Subunit: 90 residues, 4 copies
Amino acid sequence: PIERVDYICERSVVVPVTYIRSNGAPAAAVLEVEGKMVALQWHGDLKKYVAIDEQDSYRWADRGGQATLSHLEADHTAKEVTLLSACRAD
Amino acid sequence: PIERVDYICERSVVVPVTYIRSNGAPAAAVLEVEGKMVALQWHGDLKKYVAIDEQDSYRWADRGGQATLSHLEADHTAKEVTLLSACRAD
Amino acid sequence: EEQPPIERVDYICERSVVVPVTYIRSNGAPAAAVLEVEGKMVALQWHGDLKKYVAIDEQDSYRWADRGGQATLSHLEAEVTLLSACRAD
Amino acid sequence: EEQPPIERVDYICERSVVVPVTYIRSNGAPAAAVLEVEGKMVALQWHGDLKKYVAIDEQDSYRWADRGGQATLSHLEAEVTLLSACRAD
């Protein structure tokens, strides 16, 4: 139910991740990115994790061994920005 | 079920924590300490969290608003060392 | 004994990213900067002709420029702007 | 233009704690060190009489000494050893 995975991304950036699963499904992920501890909740309909802090809305997708960090700024006019697109589990 | 709490400890050390609960009980905690991401599992009998990595066995107790970071070295002769004893939720 | 001026500055950037910086000056001129960015300690040397700091490691070539309190973090594999709205706190 | 030598050294300590260090030297002598410890960027000035580095912030007074490849991180509120088994990797 708790798993530590390190990802190596573009520019050799290392993203440490903790995954928390519950009863056969993803539940939460905790990341350390951009100097922050980022807690995210699994959204099954979106097939990705979304930050619990709506004012600092990182998203994390780990799919088929490739993971992506993105972020949506708080203002409703903002568009989602991809921050790391070449992360792979070490 | 997912909560971010920052602790301020001795020497003004800041320990970021994510708590993960499941069905009314503690389940996991993720800490950033000593430059590491540390994932810990709740042990109800011990009333504390214990690192999932037996080779780097941090322990975390958050009790009555006071939290304590300790660590047990891998060798069986080691004794538990208290690393931070004056942590309080910010 | 020599005491090059050492200054800590924290920058707050877009997404409220905090970039801690130590500046080390020597005899009235910039000399070095140390940043914590993307989970890394990055040491940089001042390049006066370029008017910016360049990572000492050519294999991980961050650049850092501060002009009028606004700073930019960029990176060159072999230049991409990583943070463009850093402001001295 | 002046180029004080800049060196990155990583120390591996007890509990496998990694302390990243940047050393900045000036004209053949130690001058400054920048550490990342306990989640902080800590800038320190060399004190030749004490043969160690002392934090520039007196309110958070870390000290760092490296002698023969073995280093100690300590701290003085107003001295506690925090890491005593650091070794240059």
